[PDB]
């Protein structure tokens, strides 16, 4: 039973709205639990409280960096990083959640959530999730990024969890 | 006012174009990896007793956007070809950011300067005198830095405003 994680997203403060993702567990277990735990903060430390530090709108946000909050940092539930598990999802449209990395087997706890079809990642970036509900969140989000990603207000998991 | 040059960083991924341009901008080194999508600075500096406004484009490493170059190296008025000396193949990379400018610019004319990066690391895998030997056959200057200790930080954009000021 794949398992379901949300985000409750807020705006220099404010709250914005909830975002729902399902994890792909059956075909991604690995790359799954660890953004599972990370949502939990049962290893007491996770993604609460971080920030969405590049958004590109016409592209994607991205985040995850709860160990330096500057876009470098990060850590997965296995260590510092762990490795690409396979590259059977596609980065197929708006809603896909996908590993950012620093190049090969570099997985740590970053993140990004697609709002386009961005087919030439696939196969450099483990696709494990998907938004299930709240995409009209990540949407609005896009109105606080830039051409480079550098974001105009604090976009920040205020709270999150598992359903 | 001032006269601006327009300065473009670029070079393989990791090689420290940012890690340089922060250091002449900000005077601090970013010891992180924060690989770039595109960032732009300003400075103004006294070069040759002549004060100039000088535009940076730090340019992103990444090869799989090798394509979308094209536009920033038509807007760019000269080029800092960037190799770290720890990392052959970032030296290896150097011809075809050289080959692309020349192409996309159609001159064999174009300021460049090859810049030779992390000179402060025991680890070297590129010898001083094959960069030395490749920017002689470049026709262009070339200047050892280091990011980290600041070593020719300053020459290395001073040294490309003076081959603007030559062409121009
Ligand atoms: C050339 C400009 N340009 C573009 C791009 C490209 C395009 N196209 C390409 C596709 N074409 C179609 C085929 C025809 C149309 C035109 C258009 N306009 C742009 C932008 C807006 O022009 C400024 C990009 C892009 C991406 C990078 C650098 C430059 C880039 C880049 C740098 S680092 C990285 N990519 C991977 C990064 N790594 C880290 O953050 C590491 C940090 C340290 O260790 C943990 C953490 C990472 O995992 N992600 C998670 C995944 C999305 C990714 N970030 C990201 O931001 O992609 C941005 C973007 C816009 C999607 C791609
Ligand atoms: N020892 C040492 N490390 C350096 C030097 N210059 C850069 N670094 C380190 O090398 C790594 C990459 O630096 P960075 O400036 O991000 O390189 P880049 O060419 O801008 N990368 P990208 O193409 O992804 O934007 C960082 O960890 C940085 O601290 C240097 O002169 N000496
Ligand atoms: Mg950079």
Same mark, same amino acid.
């Given at each position: 039973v794949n398992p379901t994680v949300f985000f409750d997203i807020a705006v220099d403060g404010e709250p914005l709205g909830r975002v729902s993702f399902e994890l792909f567990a059956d075909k991604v277990p690995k790359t799954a639990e660890n953004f599972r735990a990370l949502s939990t903060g049962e290893?007491?430390?996770?993604?609460? /409280?971080?920030?969405?530090?590049?958004?590109?709108?016409?592209?994607?946000?991205?985040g995850g960096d709860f160990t330096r909050h500057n876009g470098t940092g990060g850590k997965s539930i296995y260590g510092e990083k762990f490795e690409d598990?396979?590259?059977?999802?596609?980065?197929? /449209?708006?809603?896909?959640?996908?590993?950012?990395?620093?190049?090969?087997?570099?997985?740590?706890?970053?993140?990004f959530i697609c709002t386009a079809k961005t087919e030439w990642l696939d196969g450099k970036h483990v696709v494990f999730g998907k938004?299930?509900? /709240?995409?009209?969140?990540?949407?609005?989000?896009? *109105?606080?990024?830039? *051409?480079?990603?550098?974001?105009?207000?604090?976009?920040?998991?205020?709270?999150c969890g598992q359903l | 006012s001032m006269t601006e040059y327009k300065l473009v960083v670029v070079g393989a991924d990791g090689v420290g174009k940012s890690a340089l341009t922060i250091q002449l901008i900000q005077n601090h080194f970013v010891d992180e990896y924060d690989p770039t999508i595109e960032d732009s600075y300003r400075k103004q500096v006294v070069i040759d007793g002549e004060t100039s406004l000088l535009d940076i484009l730090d340019t992103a490493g990444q090869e799989e956007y090798?394509?979308?170059? $094209?536009?920033?190296?038509?807007?760019?008025?000269?080029?800092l070809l960037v190799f770290a000396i720890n990392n052959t193949k970032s030296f290896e990379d150097i011809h075809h950011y050289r080959e692309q400018?020349?192409?996309?610019?159609?001159?064999? $004319?174009?300021?460049?300067?090859?810049?030779?990066?992390?000179? $402060?690391?025991?680890?070297?895998?590129?010898?001083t005198k094959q960069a030395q030997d490749l920017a002689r056959?470049?026709?262009?200057?070339?200047?050892?830095?280091?990011?980290?200790?600041?070593?020719?930080?300053d020459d290395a954009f001073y040294t490309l405003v003076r081959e603007i000021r030559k062409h121009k």
């Open positions: 290893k007491g430390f996770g993604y609460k /409280g971080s920030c969405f530090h590049r958004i590109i709108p016409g592209f994607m946000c991205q598990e396979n590259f059977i999802l596609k980065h197929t /449209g708006p809603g896909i959640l996908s590993m950012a990395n620093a190049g090969p087997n570099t997985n740590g706890s970053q993140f938004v299930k509900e /709240g995409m009209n969140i990540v949407e609005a989000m896009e *109105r606080f990024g830039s *051409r480079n990603g550098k974001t105009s207000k604090k976009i920040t998991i205020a709270d | 090798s394509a979308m170059r $094209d536009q920033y190296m038509r807007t760019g008025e000269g080029f400018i020349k192409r996309v610019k159609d001159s064999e $004319d174009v300021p460049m300067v090859l810049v030779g990066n992390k000179s $402060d690391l025991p680890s070297r895998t590129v010898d056959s470049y026709g262009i200057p070339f200047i050892e830095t280091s990011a980290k200790t600041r070593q020719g930080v």
